Amino acid sequence: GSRPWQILSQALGFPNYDQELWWQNTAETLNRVLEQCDYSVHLQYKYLAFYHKYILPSLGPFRRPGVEPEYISGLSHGGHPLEISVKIDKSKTICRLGLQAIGPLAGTARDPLNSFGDRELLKNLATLLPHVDLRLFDHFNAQVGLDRAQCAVATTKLIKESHNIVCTSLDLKDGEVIPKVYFSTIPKGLVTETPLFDLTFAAIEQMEVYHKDAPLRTALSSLKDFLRPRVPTDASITPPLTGLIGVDCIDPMLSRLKVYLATFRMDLSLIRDYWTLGGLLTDAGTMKGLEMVETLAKTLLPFGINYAMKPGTAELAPPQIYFPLLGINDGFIADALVEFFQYMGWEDQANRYKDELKAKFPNVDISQTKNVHRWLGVAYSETKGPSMNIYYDVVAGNV
Amino acid sequence: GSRPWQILSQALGFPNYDQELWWQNTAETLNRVLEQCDYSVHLQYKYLAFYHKYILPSLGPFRRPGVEPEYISGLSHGGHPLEISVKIDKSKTICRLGLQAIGPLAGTARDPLNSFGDRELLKNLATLLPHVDLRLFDHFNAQVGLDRAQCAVATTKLIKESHNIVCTSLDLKDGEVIPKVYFSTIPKGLVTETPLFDLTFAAIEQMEVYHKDAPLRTALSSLKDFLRPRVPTDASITPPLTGLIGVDCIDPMLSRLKVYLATFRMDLSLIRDYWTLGGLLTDAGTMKGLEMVETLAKTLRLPFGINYAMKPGTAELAPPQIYFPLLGINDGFIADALVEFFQYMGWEDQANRYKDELKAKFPNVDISQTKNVHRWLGVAYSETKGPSMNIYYDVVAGNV
Amino acid sequence: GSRPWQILSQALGFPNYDQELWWQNTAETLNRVLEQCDYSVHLQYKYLAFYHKYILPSLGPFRRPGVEPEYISGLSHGGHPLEISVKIDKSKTICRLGLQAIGPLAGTARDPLNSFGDRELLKNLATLLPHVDLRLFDHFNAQVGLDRAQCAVATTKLIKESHNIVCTSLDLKDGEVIPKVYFSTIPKGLVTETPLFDLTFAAIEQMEVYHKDAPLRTALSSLKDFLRPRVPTDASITPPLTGLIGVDCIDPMLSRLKVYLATFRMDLSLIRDYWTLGGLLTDAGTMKGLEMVETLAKTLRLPFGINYAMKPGTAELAPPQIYFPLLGINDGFIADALVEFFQYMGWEDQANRYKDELKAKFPNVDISQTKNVHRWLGVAYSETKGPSMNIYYDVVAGNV
Amino acid sequence: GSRPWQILSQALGFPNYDQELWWQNTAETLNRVLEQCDYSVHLQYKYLAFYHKYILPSLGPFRRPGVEPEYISGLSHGGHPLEISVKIDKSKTICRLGLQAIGPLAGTARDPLNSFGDRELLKNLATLLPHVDLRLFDHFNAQVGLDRAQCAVATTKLIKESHNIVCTSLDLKDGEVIPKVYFSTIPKGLVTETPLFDLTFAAIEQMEVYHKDAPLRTALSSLKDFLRPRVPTDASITPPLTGLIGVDCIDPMLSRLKVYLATFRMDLSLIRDYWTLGGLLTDAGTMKGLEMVETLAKTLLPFGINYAMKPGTAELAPPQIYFPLLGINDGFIADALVEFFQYMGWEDQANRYKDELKAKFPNVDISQTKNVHRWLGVAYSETKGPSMNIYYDVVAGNV
Ligand SMILES: COC(=O)[C@@]1(Cc2ccc(O)cc2)OC(=O)C(O)=C1c1ccc(O)cc1
Ligand SMILES: COC(=O)[C@@]1(Cc2ccc(O)cc2)OC(=O)C(O)=C1c1ccc(O)cc1
Ligand SMILES: CC(C)=CCSP(=O)(O)OP(=O)(O)O
Numbered sequence A, D: 001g002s003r004p005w006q007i008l009s010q011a012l013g014f015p016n017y018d019q020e021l022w023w024q025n026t027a028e029t030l031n032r033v034l035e036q037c038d039y040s041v042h043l044q045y046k047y048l049a050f051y052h053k054y055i056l057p058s059l060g061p062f063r064r065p066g067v068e069p070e071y072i073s074g075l076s077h078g079g080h081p082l083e084i085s086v087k088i089d090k091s092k093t094i095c096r097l098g099l100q101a102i103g104p105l106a107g108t109a110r111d112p113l114n115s116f117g118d119r120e121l122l123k124n125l126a127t128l129l130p131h132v133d134l135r136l137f138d139h140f141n142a143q144v145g146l147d148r149a150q151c152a153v154a155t156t157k158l159i160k161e162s163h164n165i166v167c168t169s170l171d172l173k174d175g176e177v178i179p180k181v182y183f184s185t186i187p188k189g190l191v192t193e194t195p196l197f198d199l200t201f202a203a204i205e206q207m208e209v210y211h212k213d214a215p216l217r218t219a220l221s222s223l224k225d226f227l228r229p230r231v232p233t234d235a236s237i238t239p240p241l242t243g244l245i246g247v248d249c250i251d252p253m254l255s256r257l258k259v260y261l262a263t264f265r266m267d268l269s270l271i272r273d274y275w276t277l278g279g280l281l282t283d284a285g286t287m288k289g290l291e292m293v294e295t296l297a298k299t300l301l302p303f304g305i306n307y308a309m310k311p312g313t314a315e316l317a318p319p320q321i322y323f324p325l326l327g328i329n330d331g332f333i334a335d336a337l338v339e340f341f342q343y344m345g346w347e348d349q350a351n352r353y354k355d356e357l358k359a360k361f362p363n364v365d366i367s368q369t370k371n372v373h374r375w376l377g378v379a380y381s382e383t384k385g386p387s388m389n390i391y392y393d394v395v396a397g398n399v
Numbered sequence B, C: 001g002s003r004p005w006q007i008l009s010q011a012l013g014f015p016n017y018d019q020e021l022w023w024q025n026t027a028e029t030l031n032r033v034l035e036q037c038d039y040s041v042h043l044q045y046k047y048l049a050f051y052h053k054y055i056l057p058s059l060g061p062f063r064r065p066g067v068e069p070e071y072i073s074g075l076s077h078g079g080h081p082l083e084i085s086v087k088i089d090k091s092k093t094i095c096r097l098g099l100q101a102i103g104p105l106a107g108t109a110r111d112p113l114n115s116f117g118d119r120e121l122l123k124n125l126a127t128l129l130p131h132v133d134l135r136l137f138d139h140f141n142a143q144v145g146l147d148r149a150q151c152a153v154a155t156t157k158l159i160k161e162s163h164n165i166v167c168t169s170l171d172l173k174d175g176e177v178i179p180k181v182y183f184s185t186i187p188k189g190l191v192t193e194t195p196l197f198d199l200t201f202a203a204i205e206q207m208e209v210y211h212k213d214a215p216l217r218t219a220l221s222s223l224k225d226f227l228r229p230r231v232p233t234d235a236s237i238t239p240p241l242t243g244l245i246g247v248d249c250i251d252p253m254l255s256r257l258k259v260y261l262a263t264f265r266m267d268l269s270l271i272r273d274y275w276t277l278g279g280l281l282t283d284a285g286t287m288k289g290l291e292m293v294e295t296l297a298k299t300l301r302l303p304f305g306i307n308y309a310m311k312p313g314t315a316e317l318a319p320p321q322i323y324f325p326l327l328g329i330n331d332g333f334i335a336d337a338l339v340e341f342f343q344y345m346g347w348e349d350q351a352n353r354y355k356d357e358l359k360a361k362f363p364n365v366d367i368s369q370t371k372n373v374h375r376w377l378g379v380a381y382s383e384t385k386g387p388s389m390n391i392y393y394d395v396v397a398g399n400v
């Protein structure tokens, strides 16, 4: 064969069988996504060669019948620590990878919450890529990381699929690899009996950039004013809750700080309350985005609400909202998205979605699966416009 | 041979020649120091095996004639990223290793200040040892580390032996390995054109434990009041200066925070000023330590060091540890001086064995002829623990 | 804990969980065997450190409930590629390790018969140990190894526990590590449809040392004359058969060449036929060994083994080593039988300690309840060295 | 940049600085050679990704001012264990890599003759490539390899650049990687005081394939009849001598066995004696090849003569002859080859040689270098026709 995923298999082979199985269950889809997103052949080789060298060893064992790994990830249905997502606009689509980098003692007494593998991966990316900055990672790792004893405590109070402290995404954008990370607040909250709100904002307010940037301190107090009445004041894990803190692994003055809420209830009034920050945002841009989100939910794991802030900007923007799609028929989802894209006037996206979906996941019949689409994120930005993020359980789509 | 260093060579061999050379110029001395400090044979194997597995690969290429590494360390005279030290009390002597963990791209464009190797080692120590903790490492790495472009700027403003941000020490204490790290403030100060005093305290004041611990804040407040009129208010790298921030890689509530001053000027009057915090400390214990330190200086190039160590839950400053620079002074003279100081302290047994044991620690060089083997001598007095002496050796200088 | 196996765990930790599990189910027993054989503490550290560094990564995944490796070994009952043996004389007891070095793609399409891992280990042993020699390994790898397509054919004609071409033993003798290997003739016989006898002797007769050494050729000629009417002339895999070729990984002029027969039928008459080479050997030493072997059999599923060992510069065959298969027979009964045989041999001290030491070697299982821990018992008599007994243990079966 | 060598640098980075320097001094030229030989872009990525993963770590340290490695290779002027060669016909050109794979203790007491690194590389290729066969390697490694003590002896009697037992070539042909190896007879001859002739033929006559193939035994006795009067009968290292044994790492029934003579004298009468095997080959094909070789030498380290035999074939063919080009001006060499290609009627090769040469080695002025062309090999085959092999010191052409 002569497609890049095939050529790279032929050129590089595999250090071990797990890496080979990961390639066999993901690289073909990845090359198809890249192709369908109009990445050049040179960028397809770039990202697939990157994937081979850096990501395959980070994915740990390939969970399969008869081989049960010590560490089970909540990123996918089968426990595989990988997702592939697309960020769609009217005119372009970006591919992103989401993973946990699995350490070799992950899920055992010497590393109960997989505390080390992501930062090792990011260390290797820092020597690969000139623009990668580890200072925000390190800052939040210091604030919400746990020692081994604490990690062992947390594993006693959390389901197997939530034994995590961090996870990593890689945006494959502008011919670069752009890393970002999310940190879990729940283990520290549980182990220290600290309110999740308190620890989130304590960690944020100790950032060097917070100390240097008045506009960020302005946006953050507004967010605190919105969130304080809505999340617990005590130490319980009662949604709605501040469950993740996200940063970009770039210059801290350029990084978006993300505060992610998880909740199990989402009805119209809450979508409204989240999206407008309780009536704080009432401008036409926010309201057009709201219409979009209400329409999506009508046309169609916790819900996600992600508030993203940037140094230099004092005003909050509407969040990105995440809908879990696990349990919903994938062909139905496809047909609903086609409708939604037509509603948005993204005609070319509507005309190609379903056929391109089948071509991403040729081993599976999408009319009969319910776990291939895992999440959908919807956003509206004053400057970039509407976008949709679709997260796929790539392993479910290949096995 | 059947000594532990030899047995482990025979059992383990070496992955590459540089590691073999490191072992050949350090492992015998380390085994000797361990023996001399009355470590059991089982602990000697524990530490030498640990050294072989964890430390040898972290030391990088062995700088030698015809082979010049990309990365040159300031830890030793020959550019080797290694020191061995002993801390001597009344009751016992502890051995400690000091290194920089050299990344494989260190001192090139992809890693100009060797920014990654020490954290890599510490990660490996965290799955090895159950009480190793990375949170203070990570905090100070966030606050005084630099991105690649900044690291590149810093190499244009620093001599080649100062292209570093962190180094690591490992106390071989009880039967454990206890890691500590020290972060340099100079690269960030130079790149951001920020006074060293300001960026040092800015980084400390953002610690989680600073926010939780009134006693630590109070101690730090007293230290700032002492330091502010003595160290530069401008961005200059001139003495005395706040050059390093030390932490123990343990539960941050138990970690000592160390602020290390470097300076070239020292006389009995400055000894008193540092030791007593300009008259703040006046008690019997402080004045007794002061007398000891004065006597050492009388009995006796790199800067002097002054290390102020603070613990969460302690509100008051104690006197610092004072480090005497010994590079360039003949090592036989130093051994005679130490024998004298030991007798002055009443440490007869230490006085009577110091010279013979020195010879025996460095059998492949005549230590009476060298001037680089003793690098530093630190002296401290604790109300709790009594007086102690830290002797730091350039092990490679004592072996090549 | 302060025993060497514990100290090395504490010093070294583990690269991954499988290695940790291997250490947790084998290292205590190995330390016990070493102690029991009167190895000094320095040798105990030497061998345990060697085991940790070289052997743990070679053992592959630790087969356990919920985790089924791609490659299953025939060396043990649970599929683990490991055995520990002791060779007991009048004067002393030597410990030996037996393993297959598992490649990372072993038992998949890219490496169906685990064809690479053992040579990789041996390469690492050659830079570790100065008297390790790869030439006979390489010779037999050339003559009875198979390419990938052939290896794939062989997996269709063999049970999963027999997907192998080579295995390795390491004698822990004097203060050294002495490697030996054994090559299987079965895969090549099956794939090429060639009689095992023919391909075994073809491979031997192409040795450089065969061409240089008349005495070896003469010995081999006598062995062929004995074997030819007893083993199949056709291509069948039926007993008695020439199933393994053993060599020592040393100077080929000093290496013993071993031809190992497997067979299921054994009674006193066949014992005599094997031991005396069908009446060829009639001397006092041979008949005395014969009596010993007969008594063992009376005192006492896997095939019997018969191992004919030949040395360059020796023209005459000596009696073989005979291996009794013990899998499935209760281990407390075996211990009682061995005590009886030891008393018969006059080895009182061995008789008096066998059972207590067995218990102590396998402290996490009750060896009186098991039937898989003793796997093999080999017995030999040398004119030169006297009688000896090799006991092979499924260490993992004695620990899980 | 977007050329494959650049893309792969961006995607993969480097495990260490030596590997980065090797890439910086060879990968650009390699991509240019591949390009100039009309390899597709997919094969350029195949071979460059292979190069990165398998060959860079095998090349050991990058010898440079201030960094003197323990092991110095005789493959190049600067001591670098690498060459890049092209095999030219009238219609196509094949690129090949020649190296020694450098072990981490090479040239020190634990590995005095670099005895291990090639077989480790070949082990990794055997899991990469289905067609790679290690049985001939192992056979000859057993016959001419030395133990450590013996290796240490040999290093006392041989120059630093001849402390070798094996070397490896990789033909980049038909979208595959095809390995072949040469083994050095000199260390064993020196250490055992055995005649080189005796040990060469002893090793060959112990091959399993020799025992199975009458035609090969027929060709080999003819070669012995030719060589016995011409090389030493005693154990001295007096050229002409049988100095290398070459095999292909493939099915032993398909492998060409090569017996390489080294000599320091080459005049017309010897070229004649070698090429015709002493008057044994007098057919028109042999004689047309002879004309070619005589013309080449007129138009333009020991000389090389390589006799290659294949199982199933009883008759010998003319050897390939190797001319060392070290010390001769590279622009002169270029202009001479241009003339030679015109004499052969390879007009298109003549018209492109010099410009393509400069483009392979843009960092150097070929009119002023004398070490870029290291060797030239000339062959004539009954079935494939004439061919020329040109061996470049790629590091000399880049530094
Ligand atoms: C927001 O949802 C999540 O936190 C996770 C894991 C999870 C958490 C709680 C649940 O009840 C079910 C799943 O579900 C996911 O699909 C997912 O990607 C989760 C996740 C996984 C790894 C992390 O490091 C963080 C979040
Ligand atoms: C035929 O020439 C050679 O053997 C080598 C090494 C060499 C050998 C003898 C000399 O007088 C000068 C150089 O010169 C080379 O250019 C070369 O590639 C040689 C060589 C290198 C590595 C090997 O493993 C075998 C031969
Ligand atoms: C971890 C999960 C489920 C969502 C993360 S938010 P995101 O970073 O993917 O969203 P954007 O990439 O910022 O558009």
Ligand SMILES: CC(C)=CCSP(=O)(O)OP(=O)(O)O
Binding pocket: B087, B098, B169, B180, B246, B305, B307, B321, B378, B390
């Ligand atoms: C490495 C340098 C110059 C000083 C280190 S201070 P220290 O950690 O050795 O002092 P203590 O070990 O706390 O006595």
Ligand SMILES: CC(C)=CCSP(=O)(O)OP(=O)(O)O
Binding pocket: C087, C098, C169, C180, C246, C305, C307, C321, C378, C390
């Ligand atoms: C591995 C099997 C079944 C037999 C090995 S025979 P051996 O090498 O153990 O016999 P000796 O060690 O030579 O006594």
Ligand SMILES: CC(C)=CCSP(=O)(O)OP(=O)(O)O
Binding pocket: D087, D169, D180, D182, D246, D304, D306, D320, D322, D375, D377, D389
């Ligand atoms: C090692 C040297 C200098 C020559 C080897 S002969 P060769 O294998 O390169 O020639 P062919 O590839 O067979 O054309």
